[PDB]
């Protein structure tokens, strides 16, 4: 890894990536099952799955016509499954480092949950982000029940925990996932808008001005449910204003977000009165 | 290496597999051409082609609308070619071990042929199944004129021969291939229904109850030509009744078979009056 | 290096190739960025992109219905970008060998230009063909006016220069690219028909009778703009007359060209009156 993923993050041709990744997922996955105790591999393959599920499965399904919705439901079910697989691969990195961990956190006993999480150091922050984000993404592809799956609450605790150890991690990547969650979940669920705007301010602290993500996250997660059409447009505009050729890294993630912003701009009618 | 096909056999996501295999075939094939005398590689790459031809070429083409049949004929011609390439790659393992073998077997002399096959031990059974199955699959896709009489009979002999050495091999995998053949080929060809039911009982001896294949093979190969709609339905039902999650191993082959069973159930109309 | 690329050039199954290449490009590309000063790698990955752009991007887009032409314009933009990436990867092999080279040859001062080109030996001919062909291909897909006449000039000079050093190179591969260019560009651009027929005679000197390319190049580049329907048909016929099973290598390139010839035959309508 390291030098190898570079030829993906820096790529602006999406189909090259879409067609080449599946065998890379398959290869990392294989290596993992061979050396299960190797934590880096564990996280790598988990993160890969989570990332692929988002860009090459869930995302494409969002651009689907509304009458084809059966296909789109299949897609979402597919992405859900993949997010989960990723989360577990990453979770194994934790379980390798802190045996019993999976048992404790997912028990959903508030005393056991928070107890095993205290065991975590900045080393593990990377793993926490991905396990959390994996489960959180899957949750979003699930219908809405009474109360909250214990896994997702555990997930959100893992994220808040990485936040304690390392608020600046990945330019506030964790804050962005939380903002999106808090905004969506009811306060019965542990979310709410006050909680979400708060998490977003923190994003702004550590995030890059050359990153389109927070702008989108703002329009999508906050502006829409608050029926603010102005900020929505303005934010999406700020995102589409970034030259992908001027950005040091993740040219790919930029192209992808800008694709999504354009679609949002065009579908502005569906989110507002 | 064999820890490596694990990430394929156990996968339930078909597209991941379909997209990642071609480069694997390409890689094995390359390795082979580099060390042709390495028998394991020989068989490996041959089996891979035969398996891919079936799952990702011939099978998809069966689900094609009947008006599109030009596309379907191209597919079948494609699959035929691939079954053959596979069979040869596997056959080279035999030719490496017993020089002259290719020459003798296709000589089409009942004696010379009874001699070379007698040289074979349980070691070679694996190779015999795949060479036999490869050719037999190709025959099914071959136009009556172009079928080549000594050839076919060689393949079938190789399979009956693995049966002598190792009747239990792969839970009676060889019996399954023979059942399908015997049922299809006229007795002029060496087939026939008595011969086929016989080969099937043997399948039952060594096969798993958690394997959907034999049930399908039963409805498909036997029930249809005997115009037994009852057993057809009942057998396809027994197959679709297996939880893929309850035999992690072979999960892929199970998903694929269940897909095919559902299609068969839906097309029952086209198979009976 | 080339024991591997054999399993591609000799393949007649196009989908196997189309599906397995992208990860190979990705791998070579990665290796390159790791050892940038390794000239072989530089060229390899450059050639690979240029080849993929042609066969798997630009070509399929030509078979697209005329009402879908948005999709087709996207394709061409995509191929353009890829031809350029390839050209630069190859150009880095030259810049590694002759530092300053990129600066000079692209300075568009005739003296500094051919000066730097004069420093080249037969070793570099391979690199010159690919850099030249890369840019020339891109030019064909560039919107009128967005080209940069210095640059097109440079590419064509590099090709004419490989011609000086090694007229026979790759069975006159360079002549074929030039024929196509000369035929298309106006004499203001450095093309023209006299210039093109000349380059083609030279092709005939070194080219194979078993290669479908020159026949096609003849119909496509020359026959069409001269409104010669006869030669067009006759040449395409000579191409489709070659048995791909009888050729030494590039069975793949043969299958591809024959595909294109058939399409050309069927679209003859759109090319003549």
């Amino acid at each position: 890894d390291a030098d190898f993923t570079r030829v993906f993050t820096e790529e602006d041709d999406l189909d090259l990536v879409a067609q080449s990744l599946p065998l890379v997922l398959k290869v990392y996955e294989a290596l993992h099952l061979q050396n299960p105790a190797h934590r880096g591999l564990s996280l790598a393959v988990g993160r890969l799955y989570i990332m692929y599920a988002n860009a090459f499965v869930q995302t494409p399904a969002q651009y689907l016509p509304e009458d084809e919705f059966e296909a789109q439901n299949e897609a979402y079910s597919r992405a859900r499954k993949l997010y989960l697989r990723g989360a577990r691969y990453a979770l194994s990195s934790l379980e390798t480092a802190y045996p019993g961990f999976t048992r404790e956190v997912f028990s959903g006993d508030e005393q056991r949950l928070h107890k095993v999480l205290s065991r975590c150091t900045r080393v593990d922050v990377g793993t926490l982000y991905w396990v959390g984000t994996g489960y959180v993404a899957a949750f979003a592809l699930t219908p809405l029940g009474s109360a909250l799956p214990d896994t997702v609450h555990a997930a959100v605790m893992m994220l808040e925990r990485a936040c304690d150890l390392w608020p600046s991690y990945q330019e506030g990547a964790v804050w962005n996932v939380l903002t999106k969650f808090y905004a969506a979940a009811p306060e019965s669920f542990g979310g709410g808008m006050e909680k979400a705007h708060t998490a977003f301010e923190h994003l702004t602290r550590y995030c890059s001005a050359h990153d389109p993500d927070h702008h989108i996250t703002y329009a999508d997660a906050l502006c829409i449910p608050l029926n603010n059409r102005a900020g929505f447009d303005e934010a999406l505009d700020r995102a589409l204003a970034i030259d992908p050729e001027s950005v040091p890294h993740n040219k790919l993630l930029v192209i992808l977000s800008q694709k999504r912003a354009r679609w949002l701009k065009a579908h502005v009618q569906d989110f507002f009165l | 290496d064999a820890d490596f096909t694990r990430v394929f056999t156990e996968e339930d996501d078909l597209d991941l597999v379909a997209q990642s295999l071609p480069l694997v075939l390409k890689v094995y094939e390359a390795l082979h051409l580099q060390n042709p005398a390495h028998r394991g590689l020989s068989l490996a790459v041959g089996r891979l082609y035969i398996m891919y031809a079936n799952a990702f070429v011939q099978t998809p083409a069966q689900y094609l609308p009947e008006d599109e049949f030009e596309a379907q004929n191209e597919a079948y011609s494609r699959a035929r070619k691939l079954y053959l390439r596979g069979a040869r790659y596997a056959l080279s393992s035999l030719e490496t071990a017993y020089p002259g073998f290719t020459r003798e077997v296709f000589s089409g002399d009942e004696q010379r042929l009874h001699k070379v096959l007698s040289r074979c031990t349980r070691v070679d059974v694996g190779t015999l199944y795949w060479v036999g199955t490869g050719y037999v699959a190709a025959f099914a896709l071959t136009p009556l004129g172009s079928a080549l009489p000594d050839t076919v009979h060689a393949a079938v002999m190789m399979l009956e021969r693995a049966c002598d050495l190792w009747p239990s091999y792969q839970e009676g995998a060889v019996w399954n291939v023979l059942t399908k053949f015997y049922a299809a080929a006229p007795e002029s060809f060496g087939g026939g229904m008595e011969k086929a039911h016989t080969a099937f009982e043997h399948l039952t001896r060594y096969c798993s109850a958690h394997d959907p294949d034999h049930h399908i093979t039963y409805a498909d190969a036997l029930c249809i030509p005997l115009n037994n709609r009852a057993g057809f339905d009942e057998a396809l039902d027994r197959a679709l009744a297996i939880d893929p999650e309850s035999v992690p191993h072979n999960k892929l082959l199970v998903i694929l078979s269940q897909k095919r069973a559902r299609w068969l159930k839906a097309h029952v109309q086209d198979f009976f009056l | 290096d080339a024991d591997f690329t054999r399993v591609f050039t000799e393949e007649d199954d196009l989908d196997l190739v189309a599906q397995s290449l992208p990860l190979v490009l990705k791998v070579y590309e990665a290796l390159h960025l790791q050892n940038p000063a390794h000239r072989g790698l530089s060229l390899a990955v450059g050639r690979l992109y240029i080849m993929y752009a042609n066969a798997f991007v630009q070509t399929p887009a030509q078979y697209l219905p005329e009402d879908e032409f948005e999709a087709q314009n996207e394709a061409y933009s995509r191929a353009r970008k890829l031809y350029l990436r390839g050209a630069r990867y190859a150009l880095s092999s030259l810049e590694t060998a002759y530092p300053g080279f990129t600066r000079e040859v692209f300075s568009g001062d005739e003296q500094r230009l051919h000066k730097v080109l004069s420093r080249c030996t037969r070793v570099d001919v391979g690199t010159l063909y690919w850099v030249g062909t890369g840019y020339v291909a891109a030019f064909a897909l560039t919107p009128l006016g967005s080209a940069l006449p210095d640059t097109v000039h440079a590419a064509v000079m590099m090709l004419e220069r490989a011609c000086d050093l090694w007229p026979s190179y790759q069975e006159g591969a360079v002549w074929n690219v030039l024929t196509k260019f000369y035929a298309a560009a106006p004499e203001s651009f450095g093309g023209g028909m006299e210039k093109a027929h000349t380059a083609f005679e030279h092709l005939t000197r070194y080219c194979s009778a078993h290669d479908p390319d020159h026949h096609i190049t003849y119909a496509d580049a020359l026959c069409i703009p001269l409104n010669n329907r006869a030669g067009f048909d006759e040449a395409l016929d000579r191409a489709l007359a070659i048995d791909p099973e009888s050729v030494p290598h590039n069975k793949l390139l043969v299958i591809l060209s024959q595909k294109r010839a058939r399409w050309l035959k069927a679209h003859v309508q759109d090319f003549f009156l």
């Binding site: - | 008006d67 009556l144 004129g145 009056l273 | -």
Partner: protein, 317 residues
């Protein structure tokens, strides 16, 4: 969506199958998706006889389980016994593919008539193959051949085996299976077949000589119930009926190309190929023409003299 279930005697990977399938596709595209043909294996229905049964009902006004079929002369005659279709299998009457092509074309109405009156439309006619004799020894004359013991596969279900035995041939009833045993046992001198069978099965090994001089066609045989045809609208009829006529034609060509390559492979394999002299061809016809009577007493009808002479008047004039 109108779907036509049609029973077929077309062998598996065979080119008659390819061609039926191409017709179902050609028809579907003519009707814009309206009509398709699903084919059902006649062996699976338990024979042409059994298949005819599945065309009836059960009740009148109620739909048969089957809207059509591809029958050989066997099924054809069970369907309309006043037909006189077995008339084309009269030895040396029609020997040529163009000659038979001439007949299926110009005499169409006269052929279709018996079947239209049984409530069928004949979508098209075609050929199963040309009879040949595969033998262990040669024959310098016809009576010499009638003297050879020669096995038929269908036989008792096929009337042409019973009338062969009426011409003076020694015809023994054997399954396709006991053939190889019977030959080596010396219980048979050879058998009746088509070049395709004899090559494809590999029975060529077991006989020294094969007859390349065309004797007479095995005709088939595609009809759709009058009632099911009425389900397709009006318009499309002409269009799709010509599509099937086109078929007969590619079939005629390819069957020829195929019979030719088969008769080639058997050549290379060490079998020697016998070719009747233009003389003998005349000389034989007159030996069969003399064999009329004892047929009309055992198999009355079965030959339509009108139809005989329409056919004679054409080919030889």
């Amino acid at each position: 969506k109108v779907v036509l279930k049609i029973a077929s005697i077309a062998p598996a990977r065979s080119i008659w199958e390819t061609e039926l399938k191409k017709l179902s596709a050609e028809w579907s595209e003519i009707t814009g998706g309206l009509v398709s043909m699903k084919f059902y294996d006649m062996s699976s229905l338990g024979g042409e006889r059994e298949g005819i049964r599945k065309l009836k009902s059960s009740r009148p006004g109620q739909a048969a389980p089957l809207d059509g079929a591809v029958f050989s002369c066997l099924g054809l005659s069970e369907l309309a016994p006043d037909s006189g279709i077995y008339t084309l299998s009269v030895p040396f009457l029609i020997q040529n593919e163009k000659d038979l092509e001439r007949v299926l074309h110009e005499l169409r109405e006269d052929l279709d008539r018996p079947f239209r009156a049984a409530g069928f439309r004949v979508i098209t006619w075609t050929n199963a193959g040309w009879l040949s004799f595969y033998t262990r020894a040669p024959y310098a004359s016809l009576g010499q051949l009638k003297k050879q013991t020669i096995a038929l596969s269908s036989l008792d279900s096929s009337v042409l085996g019973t009338c062969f035995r009426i011409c003076g041939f020694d015809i023994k009833d054997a399954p396709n299976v006991r053939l190889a045993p019977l030959l080596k046992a010396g219980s048979i001198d050879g058998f009746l077949s088509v070049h395709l069978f004899t090559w494809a099965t590999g029975f060529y090994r077991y006989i020294s000589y094969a007859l390349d001089t065309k004797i007479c066609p095995a005709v088939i045989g595609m009809l759709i119930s009058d009632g099911s045809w009425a389900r397709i609208p009006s318009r499309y009829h002409d269009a799709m009926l010509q599509a099937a006529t086109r078929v007969r034609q590619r079939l005629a060509n390819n069957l020829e190309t195929l019979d030719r390559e088969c008769s080639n492979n058997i050549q290379k394999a060490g079998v020697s190929i016998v070719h009747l002299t233009p003389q003998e061809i005349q000389e034989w016809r007159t030996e069969f023409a003399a064999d009329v009577k004892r047929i009309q007493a055992r198999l009355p009808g079965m030959l339509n003299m009108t139809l005989y002479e329409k056919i004679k008047h054409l080919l030889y004039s």
